[PDB]
Enzyme design. Structure first.
Site, PDB file in Angstrom:
ATOM      1  N   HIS A  41      36.220 -65.001 -36.706  1.00 38.58           N
ATOM      2  CA  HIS A  41      36.769 -65.907 -35.713  1.00 38.58           C
ATOM      3  C   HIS A  41      36.212 -67.315 -35.808  1.00 38.58           C
ATOM      4  CE1 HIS A  41      33.231 -64.467 -33.176  1.00 38.58           C
ATOM      5  NE2 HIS A  41      33.214 -65.753 -32.849  1.00 38.58           N
ATOM      6  N   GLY A 143      27.066 -70.331 -29.803  1.00 44.47           N
ATOM      7  CA  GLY A 143      26.550 -70.638 -31.118  1.00 44.47           C
ATOM      8  C   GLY A 143      25.701 -69.552 -31.727  1.00 44.47           C
ATOM      9  N   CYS A 145      26.773 -66.639 -32.457  1.00 44.17           N
ATOM     10  CA  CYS A 145      27.601 -65.777 -33.290  1.00 44.17           C
ATOM     11  C   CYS A 145      27.184 -65.848 -34.751  1.00 44.17           C
ATOM     12  CB  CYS A 145      29.066 -66.144 -33.138  1.00 44.17           C
ATOM     13  SG  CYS A 145      29.754 -65.375 -31.656  1.00 44.17           S
TER      14      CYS A 145
HETATM   15  C1  LIG Z   1      30.222 -66.471 -30.481  1.00 40.14           C
HETATM   16  O1  LIG Z   1      31.541 -66.563 -30.950  1.00 40.14           O
HETATM   17  C2  LIG Z   1      29.600 -67.830 -30.823  1.00 40.14           C
HETATM   18  O2  LIG Z   1      28.423 -67.997 -30.780  1.00 40.14           O
HETATM   19  N1  LIG Z   1      30.542 -68.886 -31.243  1.00 40.14           N
HETATM   20  C3  LIG Z   1      30.113 -70.238 -31.615  1.00 40.14           C
HETATM   21  C4  LIG Z   1      30.246 -71.136 -30.376  1.00 40.14           C
HETATM   22  C5  LIG Z   1      30.819 -70.543 -29.075  1.00 40.14           C
HETATM   23  C6  LIG Z   1      30.925 -71.312 -27.999  1.00 40.14           C
HETATM   24  C7  LIG Z   1      30.471 -72.776 -28.075  1.00 40.14           C
HETATM   25  C8  LIG Z   1      29.976 -73.286 -29.201  1.00 40.14           C
HETATM   26  C9  LIG Z   1      29.853 -72.401 -30.439  1.00 40.14           C
HETATM   27  C10 LIG Z   1      30.239 -66.135 -28.996  1.00 40.14           C
HETATM   28  C11 LIG Z   1      28.886 -65.616 -28.481  1.00 40.14           C
HETATM   29  C12 LIG Z   1      28.939 -65.409 -26.927  1.00 40.14           C
HETATM   30  C13 LIG Z   1      29.052 -66.764 -26.271  1.00 40.14           C
HETATM   31  C14 LIG Z   1      27.922 -66.778 -25.165  1.00 40.14           C
HETATM   32  N2  LIG Z   1      27.066 -65.548 -25.430  1.00 40.14           N
HETATM   33  C15 LIG Z   1      27.687 -64.737 -26.480  1.00 40.14           C
HETATM   34  O3  LIG Z   1      27.256 -63.714 -26.906  1.00 40.14           O
HETATM   35  N3  LIG Z   1      31.245 -65.093 -28.944  1.00 40.14           N
HETATM   36  C16 LIG Z   1      32.457 -65.427 -28.198  1.00 40.14           C
HETATM   37  O4  LIG Z   1      32.525 -66.474 -27.657  1.00 40.14           O
HETATM   38  C17 LIG Z   1      33.602 -64.427 -28.090  1.00 40.14           C
HETATM   39  C18 LIG Z   1      34.704 -64.628 -29.128  1.00 40.14           C
HETATM   40  C19 LIG Z   1      34.952 -63.189 -29.644  1.00 40.14           C
HETATM   41  C20 LIG Z   1      35.936 -63.080 -30.812  1.00 40.14           C
HETATM   42  C21 LIG Z   1      36.343 -62.593 -29.405  1.00 40.14           C
HETATM   43  N4  LIG Z   1      34.186 -64.499 -26.777  1.00 40.14           N
HETATM   44  C22 LIG Z   1      35.436 -65.178 -26.514  1.00 40.14           C
HETATM   45  C23 LIG Z   1      35.950 -65.191 -25.175  1.00 40.14           C
HETATM   46  C24 LIG Z   1      35.227 -64.537 -24.110  1.00 40.14           C
HETATM   47  C25 LIG Z   1      34.020 -63.885 -24.402  1.00 40.14           C
HETATM   48  N5  LIG Z   1      33.203 -63.172 -23.430  1.00 40.14           N
HETATM   49  C26 LIG Z   1      33.334 -63.320 -22.002  1.00 40.14           C
HETATM   50  O5  LIG Z   1      34.267 -63.887 -21.550  1.00 40.14           O
HETATM   51  O6  LIG Z   1      32.277 -62.768 -21.250  1.00 40.14           O
HETATM   52  C27 LIG Z   1      32.486 -62.250 -19.940  1.00 40.14           C
HETATM   53  C28 LIG Z   1      31.139 -61.655 -19.489  1.00 40.14           C
HETATM   54  C29 LIG Z   1      33.568 -61.147 -19.872  1.00 40.14           C
HETATM   55  C30 LIG Z   1      32.879 -63.392 -18.985  1.00 40.14           C
HETATM   56  C31 LIG Z   1      33.489 -63.874 -25.775  1.00 40.14           C
HETATM   57  O7  LIG Z   1      32.294 -63.232 -26.064  1.00 40.14           O
END
Ligand SMILES: *[C@](O)(C(=O)NCc1ccccc1)[C@H](C[C@@H]1CCNC1=O)NC(=O)[C@H](CC1CC1)n1cccc(NC(=O)OC(C)(C)C)c1=O
Ligand SMILES: *[C@](O)(C(=O)NCc1ccccc1)[C@H](C[C@@H]1CCNC1=O)NC(=O)[C@H](CC1CC1)n1cccc(NC(=O)OC(C)(C)C)c1=O
EC number: 3.4.19.12
Lengths: 305, 305
Positions: A41, A143, A145
Site C-alpha cells: 500500500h 510512518g 509501516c
Molecule cells: C502504515 O500504513 C504507515 O505507517 N504508513 C505510512 C504513513 C501513514 C500515515 C501518515 C504518514 C505515513 C499505517 C500504520 C498505522 C498508522 C498509525 N498506527 C499504525 O499502526 N497503517 C495504516 O495506516 C493502515 C493502511 C492499511 C492498508 C490498510 N490503515 C488505513 C486506514 C485506517 C487504519 N486503522 C484505523 O483506522 O484504526 C482504528 C483504530 C480502527 C481507528 C489503518 O491502520
C-alpha cells in the site's frame, strides 16, 4: 538473576532498514541482498485507500516512481513485483550488511522482537507476541509501516512480521514476509474487527516457572490437579486450553525447578480463582503471558547470539 | 498507537562489545577507539574477592595477562590503567565501529537501555531505570559483568552504566564509565544492602499522560489538588515528593492532552487511595514508574535515531 521483558539485539536488523517513497507515501522497507520489501500500500494515495485495486494501481507504476533511500544514499530500482500484500523492488546494489536470514510464519502464542522504524530510521525495540486473534499489542505511529518483527537463533535472523495497520482498541496487524496477513485482515481502509483474545496458558506457566527460578515462590501451594480439572477452571477465565503437548514443552522448566507441571497448574488454578491480593510476581500485578518457555530458558541460562 | 516498554536500537553498542579475560576470570568490556573499558575486578580470583587490594593485584599484572577478544580476533594490549572501579586497557587497534559517544552520569529517576552481554556477545536488550536507592532492576547472570547501559540522542550514544554486581532481592549495582559506583556500594564480596526505594512520582504521572494519549481515560476524575495535598498523600505511599520542577517538566504532556498537571495529580491521588479494583491502565495492573516524561514524548511522537 532478575527477569525483564527482553528484546533481541537489533543490530543485524538496523542495517537492513530503508525508506521507500512512492508519490505521496513514505514508509519503511526491508533490504536484503538486491531486494527491498515493503507493504504494497505504499502505492496508494489517501483516496485509493477505501477499496484499492492494487494490480491496477501497480501497472500504472514504473521503476522510477519508487524512491528507495538507504540513509544518505539513493538506490536504483531496476524491477518491481507484488507478492500478496508486499512489494518486491529489485535494486541494483546488494545490501552489504545483509545478515544470514530466513522468512518464517509464526503461530499464535509465539513471541518476537519488533524494531520500530520511521523514515527508514530505527526508533526503538520491544518484545511482543502473536495473539490468538492474530493481532499484536505493538507501539506504532504514522510512518511505522514496514517495520519488521524478528527472532535470532545463533547468527540467523528469522523475519516473521511486517507491520501494516492499526485495529480497534490499539492493537496491530501485519503480514509475514511473503505478504500474507496473520488473521482475517485485508489492507484496505474498511471496518475490521479483531476476534476475541485468549490468555496464552502455556506462557503464563513458563513465567510462573521463571519466578520460582528467580526466588519469587510465595504462590506455590501443595496440591496437584489434572489437565481436565485445570482446563475446566481455565476456560471460565478465557485461558487457552492446556494440552499434553503444552505439558511436554514445559518439561525442561519443570526439570530445572523440581516442580511438576500439574503441580504448577494447581498453583495457577488457585491464582486464577483467588487473585493476587495485592501481591506481585516478578514485579507484576498481573499474570504475564508474553514469555514463551523458550524465552524463559533463553533468559535464565544466558543464551547469546 | 499502543505503548510498550521500548529500548533503544542496540546496533551502535553491539559493535563495541568485546570479551576480556585475565587469568581465571572472563567478563565483558567496552571498546571505544583504542581503549577497552571493563570492571577492575576482572583481575581478581575468587579468593581475592573478600577484600581485594586492587592496586596490589594490579601491579602484579602486565599487559599480556589481559586477553581481549573481539569476536574472531585477538587484540593486543599495549597499556593498562585503573580509574576508580574500571580498568582501562589501551589496545593497538582503534575500534573501526566506534560510534559518536559520551560518558554521562545519570540521576535517580532517569531511564536507559541495557544490552545484556556474555563472553563479549549480546544476549538481549531491555529498558530500565536508576532507582532512588541507586540500584537497577536488571536481568543479569554470571558473566554479564561489563555490560553497559546507554541512551541515544540523534546519533550520539551516552554511556551511563557498567554492570558490576547483584545485591539482596535480585537488584543490581554498577558504575558510570569513569568507574564511580552509583550509590554506596563497593566492588568487594561483603554484605551490602540496597536501601529503601521510592516510587518515581513524576514518571507515574507521565505514564498516566501516555495512557490518556492512547485512549485509556477511565481513571480521569474531575477534581484538582495542590502540591501540598498531593505530597501529603503520596509520601504516605512512599512516592517521591513532587516538586514545582516536576510540574514544569510535565508541561508538554499536559499541553498535548489538555489536562492540567494538578488535575492529573488529583486522578493519581484517588488511584493511590482507592486502588485499581481489577482495572488495568495500558495493559498494566500496577502504576508504572519506569517511563520518564521524555520517554513518553519520544514514543508517542516517533523520535528516531
Ligand atoms: C502504515 O500504513 C504507515 O505507517 N504508513 C505510512 C504513513 C501513514 C500515515 C501518515 C504518514 C505515513 C499505517 C500504520 C498505522 C498508522 C498509525 N498506527 C499504525 O499502526 N497503517 C495504516 O495506516 C493502515 C493502511 C492499511 C492498508 C490498510 N490503515 C488505513 C486506514 C485506517 C487504519 N486503522 C484505523 O483506522 O484504526 C482504528 C483504530 C480502527 C481507528 C489503518 O491502520
Ligand atoms: C560479574 O562479576 C560477572 O559477570 N563476572 C564474570 C563471571 C562471574 C561468575 C562466573 C563466571 C564469570 C558478576 C555479575 C553477577 C553474577 C550473577 N548476576 C550478577 O549480576 N558480579 C559479581 O559476581 C560480584 C563481584 C563484584 C566485585 C564485587 N559479586 C561477588 C560476590 C557476591 C555477589 N553478589 C551476591 O552475593 O548476591 C546476593 C544476592 C547478595 C547473594 C556479586 O555480585
Amino acid at each position: 538473576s532478575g527477569f525483564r521483558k527482553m528484546a533481541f539485539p537489533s543490530g543485524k536488523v538496523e542495517g537492513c532498514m530503508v525508506q521507500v517513497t512512492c508519490g505521496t507515501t513514505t514508509l519503511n522497507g526491508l533490504w536484503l541482498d538486491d531486494v527491498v520489501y515493503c507493504p504494497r500500500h505504499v502505492i496508494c494515495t489517501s483516496e485509493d485507500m477505501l477499496n484499492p485495486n492494487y494490480e491496477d494501481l501497480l501497472i500504472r507504476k514504473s521503476n522510477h516512481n519508487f524512491l528507495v533511500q538507504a540513509g544518505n544514499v539513493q538506490l536504483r530500482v531496476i524491477g518491481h513485483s507484488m507478492q500478496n500484500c508486499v512489494l518486491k523492488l529489485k535494486v541494483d546494489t546488494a545490501n552489504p550488511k545483509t545478515p544470514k536470514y530466513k522468512f518464517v510464519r509464526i503461530q499464535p502464542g509465539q513471541t518476537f522482537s519488533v524494531l520500530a522504524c520511521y523514515n527508514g530510521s530505527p526508533s526503538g525495540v520491544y518484545q511482543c507476541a502473536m495473539r490468538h486473534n492474530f493481532t499484536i499489542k505493538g507501539s506504532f505511529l504514522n510512518g511505522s509501516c514496514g517495520s519488521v518483527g524478528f527472532n535470532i537463533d545463533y547468527d540467523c535472523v528469522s523475519f516473521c512480521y511486517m507491520h501494516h495497520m492499526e485495529l480497534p482498541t490499539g492493537v496491530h496487524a501485519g503480514t509475514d514476509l511473503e505478504g500474507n496477513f496473520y488473521g482475517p485482515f485485508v489492507d484496505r481502509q474498511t471496518a475490521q474487527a479483531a476476534g476475541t483474545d485468549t490468555t496464552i496458558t502455556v506462557n503464563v506457566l513458563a513465567w510462573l516457572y521463571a519466578a520460582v527460578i528467580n526466588g519469587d515462590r510465595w504462590f506455590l501451594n501443595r496440591f496437584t490437579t489434572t489437565l481436565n480439572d485445570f482446563n475446566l477452571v481455565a476456560m471460565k477465565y478465557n485461558y487457552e486450553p492446556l494440552t499434553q503437548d503444552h505439558v511436554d514443552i514445559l518439561g525442561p522448566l519443570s526439570a530445572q525447578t523440581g516442580i511438576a507441571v500439574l503441580d504448577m497448574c494447581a498453583s495457577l488454578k488457585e491464582l486464577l480463582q483467588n487473585g493476587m491480593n495485592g501481591r506481585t510476581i516478578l514485579g507484576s500485578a498481573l499474570l504475564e503471558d508474553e514469555f514463551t518457555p523458550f524465552d524463559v530458558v533463553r533468559q535464565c541460562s544466558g543464551v547469546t547470539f
